[PDB]
């Protein structure tokens, strides 16, 4: 019949934690599901988790008097019966607000065959070839992250000095226009006696003001040289991380899939830290 034992249910996982079911129903299409043993451990509860639109729904499978189901009238034989009944029927039978059908089961033989090197002799060597690089994406990613967070600390300082020079340079120019107000009628037009004090008084005072107002503008224009050289390099190190972060996500799916295929399912070793 279609009533088999849940020991061979490919969608059946059994004894795993709530925090590993969450990253198996993460960003997946609706009607994705699996069944595992309850956490309260009554030996035969088998909770069900359903992914209906973002959220992970969680459904109970009661086990009174050798019968199965969701409601009080438990009227099914096995979970392989109850799970196959809803892989082609709608869950709106039980819940009018849960019109979903158990479409995509989360298998486990799907990724156990993706592994290669059937003999264990190549498993330890196809393993050490994938832990030298994941332990290199560790260093290669933090060598180019402090250099990122550091340069972000420098741009915020240089960008503040420019608000310093844009204030200073405006404090000098506000005097050249108020200097000219006085210098035209109070001390030179009234002093028309052919004296040379104006060449020493205003001609030697107005010159040092103009040798300062431009003297500061030559350092604001100079400060922005390294700010532009630095804001450009801040994007070059922000682009190098993006070409490294996704490849740093794949090597964490290849080591763990080689630390489980034979490294633990083939043996329960405390020998983990020499065959890596």
For other proteins, the binding residues (CB under 8 A) are: 17-19, 22, 26-27, 39-41, 47, 53-55, 57-60, 70, 95, 98, 145, 155, 160-161, 163-164, 166-168, 171-172, 175, 178-183, 186-187, 197, 201-202, 205-206, 208-209, 212, 216, 231, 234-235, 238-240, 242-243, 245-246, 249-250
Cβ–Cβ < 8 Å for 101, 90: yes
Give least dist CB 125 to other proteins, A.
22
Give least dist CB 4 to other proteins, A.
26
Give least dist CB 275 to other proteins, A.
17
- Cα distance between residue 82 and residue 103, in whole Å: 14
In whole angstroms, how far apart are CA 10 and each of 2, 105, 151, 232, 259? 14, 8, 51, 53, 21
**Distance of alpha carbon 76 from the chain centroid:** 45
Cβ–Cβ < 8 Å for 213, 183: no
Cβ–Cβ < 8 Å for 160, 256: no
User: How is residue 6 written in tokens?
Assistant: 């849940």
- Cα distance between residue 10 and residue 79, in whole Å: 12
Nearest to other proteins of 13, 234 (CB atom)? 234
Give least dist CB 23 to other proteins, A.
9
Nearest to other proteins of 145, 266 (CB atom)? 145
Give least dist CB 18 to other proteins, A.
7
Pairing of strands 47-52, 32-36: antiparallel
Give least dist CB 57 to other proteins, A.
6
Nearest to other proteins of 78, 183 (CB atom)? 183
Nearest to other proteins of 214, 250 (CB atom)? 250
Give least dist CB 70 to other proteins, A.
7
CA nearest neighbour of 80 among 48, 110, 38, 42: 48
In sequence order, the 6+-apart residues with CB closer than 8 A to the CB of 23 are none
Nearest to other proteins of 24, 212 (CB atom)? 212
Nearest to other proteins of 77, 111 (CB atom)? 111
User: How is residue 147 written in tokens?
Assistant: 């250099």
DSSP 8-state secondary structure symbol assigned to residue 54 = T
Nearest to other proteins of 2, 205 (CB atom)? 205
Which strand (E) or helix (H) includes residue 249?
Answer: helix 247-254
């Amino acid at each position: 019949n279609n009533n088999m034992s849940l020991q061979d249910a490919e969608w059946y996982w059994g004894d795993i934690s709530r925090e590993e079911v969450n990253e198996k129903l993460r960003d997946t299409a609706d009607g994705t599901f699996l069944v595992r043993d309850a956490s309260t451990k009554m030996h035969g509860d088998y909770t069900l988790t359903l992914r209906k639109g973002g959220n992970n729904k969680l459904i109970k499978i009661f086990h009174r008097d050798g019968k199965y189901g969701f409601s009080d009238p438990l009227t099914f034989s096995s979970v392989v019966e109850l799970i196959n009944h809803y892989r082609n029927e709608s869950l709106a039978q039980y819940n009018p607000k849960l019109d979903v059908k158990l479409l995509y089961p989360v298998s486990k033989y799907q990724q156990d065959q993706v592994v290669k090197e059937d003999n264990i002799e190549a498993v330890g060597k196809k393993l050490h070839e994938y832990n030298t690089q994941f332990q290199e994406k560790s260093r290669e990613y933090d060598r180019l992250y402090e250099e990122y967070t550091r340069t972000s600390q420098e741009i915020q300082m240089k960008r503040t000095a420019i608000e310093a020079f844009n204030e200073t340079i405006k404090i000098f120019e506000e005097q050249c226009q108020t200097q000219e107000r006085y210098s035209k009628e109070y001390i030179e037009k009234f002093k028309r006696e052919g004296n040379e004090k104006e060449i020493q008084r205003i001609m030697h005072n107005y010159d040092k003001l103009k040798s300062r107002i431009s003297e500061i503008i030559d350092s604001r224009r100079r400060l922005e040289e390294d700010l532009k050289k630095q804001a450009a390099e801040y994007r070059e190190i922000d682009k190098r991380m993006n070409s490294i972060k996704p490849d740093l996500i794949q090597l964490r799916k290849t080591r763990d899939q080689y630390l489980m295929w034979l490294t633990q399912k083939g043996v329960r070793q405390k020998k983990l830290n020499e065959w890596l």
